[PDB]
Amino acid sequence: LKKIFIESPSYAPNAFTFDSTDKGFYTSVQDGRVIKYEGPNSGFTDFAYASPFWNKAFCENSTDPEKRPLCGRTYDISYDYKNSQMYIVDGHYHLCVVGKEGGYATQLATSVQGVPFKWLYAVTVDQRTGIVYFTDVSSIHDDSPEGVEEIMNTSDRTGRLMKYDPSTKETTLLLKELHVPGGAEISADGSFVVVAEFLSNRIVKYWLEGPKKGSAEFLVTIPNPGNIKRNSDGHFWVSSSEELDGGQRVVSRGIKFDGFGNILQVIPLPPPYEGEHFEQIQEHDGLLYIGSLFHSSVGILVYDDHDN
Ligand SMILES: *[C]C1(*)(*)(*)N(*)[C@@](*)(*)[C@](*)(*)C2(*)(*)(*)=C1(*)(*)(*)[N@@](*)(*)C1(*)(*)(*)=[C@@](*)(*)[C@](*)(*)=[C@](*)(*)[C@@](*)(*)=C12(*)(*)*
């Protein structure tokens, strides 16, 4: 297992997505930007900003939590191929979208059933229907240090799963009282959405079709599950960390599972991720993109097989 680091601006490149050109990638960073890597000999450019207030002088390269409400902080991004546009979920500006050329994003939704969003975290677009599925970590606590602390202390179970439909412009509540839903990924065939409940160490399966449509069921136990991203085979990669029996400390792993809950592949991450929580593992073009809040470079894994 080989690791590659790509030096990036700002800090904490946590989430990735890709467009039809498939040259490079997009990533969300701590200072409120969505940036685009253009290739090994042309670095990063700014792509988009959820916050309409974002500006270089005040927000570029900041990690001051006090500047977050103004600059924004995007937690996930999902490219819509049919419409050449990028969906965004931000901790301060909520569900947004930006067209192909980027720039400042258009805000789409900030509440459901009269209850404001507090910390949108994961997003995915159904490539066939253009319908957007996304999670809110809490209905009480935002991404401030004070908020994170309260979520932990009260074992906050006020997370939600929503859908947004661009043809109605309405958003609908699918699930409530989730236990820190930091990951959500639609099946290849659109029949279900898998949701990671970080504080309950599990993945649940929410049905979009079939006789159980509109309900969710337990799928598989995963320690401290984060983001979920589907690969081209239709399987799901999730970030995981497990406290080590005998240690102290965690062991970090990427875990690939199917829609029936079978564990298909387990990848212990190498340093520096090995003993740290991480955000996401996403398979694309034969590479594993690793999202984290704890580094200033993007991490990518590939296996070296030049001997067998
Ligand atoms: C799951 C992950 N991501 C989302 C959010 C979060 C996580 N974890 C935690 C802890 C505490 C608070 C919040 C959180």
From Swiss-Prot:
Monomer. It catalyses: 3alpha(S)-strictosidine + H2O = secologanin + tryptamine. GO terms for cellular component: endomembrane system; vacuole. This is Strictosidine synthase. Belongs to the strictosidine synthase family. Catalyzes the stereospecific condensation of tryptamine with secologanin to form strictosidine, the key intermediate of indole alkaloid biosynthesis. Its EC number is 3.5.99.13. InterPro entries: 6-blade_b-propeller_TolB-like (IPR011042), Strictosidine_synth_cons-reg (IPR018119). Pathway: Alkaloid biosynthesis; 3alpha(S)-strictosidine biosynthesis; 3alpha(S)-strictosidine from secologanin and tryptamine: step 1/1. The gene is STR1. Keywords: Alkaloid metabolism, Glycoprotein, Hydrolase, Signal, Vacuole. The keyword Glycoprotein applies. The lineage of its organism: Eukaryota, Viridiplantae, Streptophyta, Embryophyta, Tracheophyta. Glycans are attached at residues 61, 153. It is found in: Vacuole. The keyword Cell membrane does not apply.
